[PDB]
Design an enzyme around this catalytic site. Sequence first.
Site: not given
Lengths: 446, 198, 446
Positions: C64, C70, C364, C385
Amino acid sequence: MSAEITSGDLDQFKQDLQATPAANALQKAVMNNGINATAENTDSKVAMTPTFSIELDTGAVSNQKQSGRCWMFAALNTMRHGIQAQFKIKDFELSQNYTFFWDKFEKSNYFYENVLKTADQPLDSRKVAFLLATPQQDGGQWDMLSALIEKYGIVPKSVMPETYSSSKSNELNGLLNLKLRKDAVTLRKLVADKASDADIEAAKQKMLAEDYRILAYTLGNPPTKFDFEYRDDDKNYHIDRELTPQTFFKKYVGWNLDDYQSIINAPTADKPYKHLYTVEMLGNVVGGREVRHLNLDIDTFKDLAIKQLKAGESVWFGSDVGQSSDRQLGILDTNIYKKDDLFNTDFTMTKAERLDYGESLMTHAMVLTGVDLVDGKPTKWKVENSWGEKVGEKGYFVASDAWFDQFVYQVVISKKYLPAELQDVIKNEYDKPTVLAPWDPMGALA
Amino acid sequence: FWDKFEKSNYFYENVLKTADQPLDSRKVAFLLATPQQDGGQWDMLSALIEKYGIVPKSVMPETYSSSKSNELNGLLNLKLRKDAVTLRKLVADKASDADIEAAKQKMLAEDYRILAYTLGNPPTKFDFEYRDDDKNYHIDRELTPQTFFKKYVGWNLDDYQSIINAPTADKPYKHLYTVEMLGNVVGGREVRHLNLDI
Amino acid sequence: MSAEITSGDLDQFKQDLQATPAANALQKAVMNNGINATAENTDSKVAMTPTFSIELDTGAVSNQKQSGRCWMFAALNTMRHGIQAQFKIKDFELSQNYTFFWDKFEKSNYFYENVLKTADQPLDSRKVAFLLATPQQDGGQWDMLSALIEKYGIVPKSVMPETYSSSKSNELNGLLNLKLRKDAVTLRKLVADKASDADIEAAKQKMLAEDYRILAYTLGNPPTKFDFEYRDDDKNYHIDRELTPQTFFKKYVGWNLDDYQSIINAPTADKPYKHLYTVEMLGNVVGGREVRHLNLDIDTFKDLAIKQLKAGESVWFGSDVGQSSDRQLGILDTNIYKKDDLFNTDFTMTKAERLDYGESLMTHAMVLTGVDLVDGKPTKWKVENSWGEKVGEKGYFVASDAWFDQFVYQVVISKKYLPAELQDVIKNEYDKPTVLAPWDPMGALA
């Protein structure tokens, strides 16, 4: 069994570890950051601010790069600050490659003569092994640099610039050491075969011709005659024609190299004070002056350094710079780390014990250029290093007085600052010094 | 970890053994010049594995000092030299074997702590979880360093011989050689080199 | 005086500090290295090795960059792993810029409608101030991403690539927030001046035309029709012509977005379990579906996640990733640091206290892609992630089960894994959820 580490002993060591105050938290710090970064003490940083009641104006530092030429850089620093002040040439530098060339070449001959002299002794004898382990190296001592200057003079840096090898000497030392060892084989063989002195001399001359060529290729041709052109600090142009390295030395530096005495502080039982010492087999220039150290107590040693500083003259010194030092910030202080506190362990040794037990010896030569005197006593010393400007304070270091006590082993002082009694020791013992063993710690070359 | 710790004890025993010899003698000087170091030889690594086994890397990871050992060697050498002073003094002063053993144990406790702080605590029991190359998961519980060695490696360390080629006159071929004072694990196997032609 | 810090209190605090075990050595560690590097625990690193008894095959991570997207990356991750497996397109990515465009534009309209709705309330009122403090932002929640996909579909990344602003959104948020605030002035004024609904609608449409242009310039034109060409993992070429974002979604993903429920674990007194919750004023797409969270106890929450993983489906989740985390190594573990030990201070709060007292909330969104089950209980969770491959294990993180307990607040679960009783709560309360305040912690946008 008392001699081995048993499971019971391991249990006990783990118990001792867990009983240590904050062991878990301290362990994590040192595992993560290492010793230095865990133990480094900001109180020292505060105490070691680079302010000095006596401070010489010495300008910008030099940089030896990846070579062990500290002793040369430091000596040439003392001379070039004289030139800069007298002739008004800010930041002027002498050629460290010039001294490096003649040092290596003279050491090649020195080594051969040492091999000849021990050629009747077994190859595995301690002295033959010591010779062969380090046929030559970059380092030296003050009297060896003098010997070079006496025989060869000096030149401006611009006149004999650095090369690849002068600023990264590892490959040159590797090849020259190989060459010298190979030649040691041949020289021992000649002596075994009862060759004449003349055949042995002829062989040595051919060996030296080859060594000369290895150094000329690596380092360049040493100059014999040059013109010197510069602008002084008042912007006036000067030209001085057809100088030699020796006339340049005589005109721009002008020292009588006899005027200087190497002083040591080695407080061990074999070295009583107020005598001269030398080191067996230690040297570079066959036929030139030998190493002579006058051992004195640390108070007298330090008072001489201060006297010389107060007269406006910098002082070449030898120390163990890797001891109790932050070599990035340039702080040399017994307080810079608190390792004993960190590990809950006493790590104290005296200066004599560190010498005797192989823990410390001179490893690096630098120059004192200042001293802070508070209530008439030194607290800290200003140190010109030769590692360029990106360490310390534009390449200057600071050493606490406690650090100096422990880790400085040598200063070079002008004889005129010495009491008559010590001027007399020097004259009386010059030809009969106490001869230390080759592997003595004061035989350390920096 | 175990190499450094065993070498600390090895050094003390060498100092004890030479404590009647002059400080400036060649063998005492050789000892003090390099109290310990990082390097070694095959039989010294075997000695360590025989006594302590082995673990996966994930189970005892690197630290600052393990991957940059200069500061650890500097401080440990200083410690060992300081202790050599004390040990020679004890032998000079005709201390009993028991007082000398007690002193050595206190010295070792400190050395243990320097290594635990620098390198971590050596594991004694762990689980091993992994995926094989066919992507199958495996878990093996409550292993020790010694059972891990026995199961995953499974060698008899006696089966191995150090062979050298040192073509010098003092070393005829087809014999075994060792090196005086050279070692790490007191009580463990010694260095043995068989010299053979190239 | 009890209220002020006196010299006597300072003396006592210095005494307490000096009585602390190893205070001097620990102080030096933390002064030199900071908190994290002093406190980080290698035992956690050992425990957190990235091996998982249940592990989905999810390929390479997305990134990102310098944006707060996120929630979008994580949702699109769940969809694209479906595509990759079904259509055999290794590492296939959907356009995060596509969702970013429509999110910002819908949020611009959402903001105006919120301003209209509160235009009769004082400017300094808590709800008007909350609106104006953050007119829009990058973050969101699962139901807001669904709303976008329902209305606009999705496209391959290649079809709406990143721009400067999509991957570094700070300047866009600054200018758009300025624009929205300026327009809020005009909108409140219109309502104060008793303008007609039609004049107010016309004004809003002109404002939106400008916002549209700011986003088209920053982010590009959203596609309406495209061809999709690719090679599958067996190396076969495919071309699919004249797709729209909506037909692409229907064909390549094929989900009924109704099938998904946002589940939270917020163990506070105002939020009894087995009910639905929403957040006042929180949203992006006017007219689209609203936020609905089902609050459940942590055991039930975790058992649903495991059930979904064991079925081969990844799980979008919301957490406070800045808590008890090493974000370089990608370890999320209550044991990664031992700060309480380092400072000899208890820093414990419960999950309820951290919410209630502003210490923690979802910050997040990531994706669960694995769980290690030992004796039938989870020890650690595998985390995809969206920060690219140079953090964690090729961009994957690992979260201890203790960490999950404390710091995970939301998971999105397919309704079919829910017990009937909970399927019924959802149906029964859908139109009458408990309405949380705007500044509720579960109103946090990640």
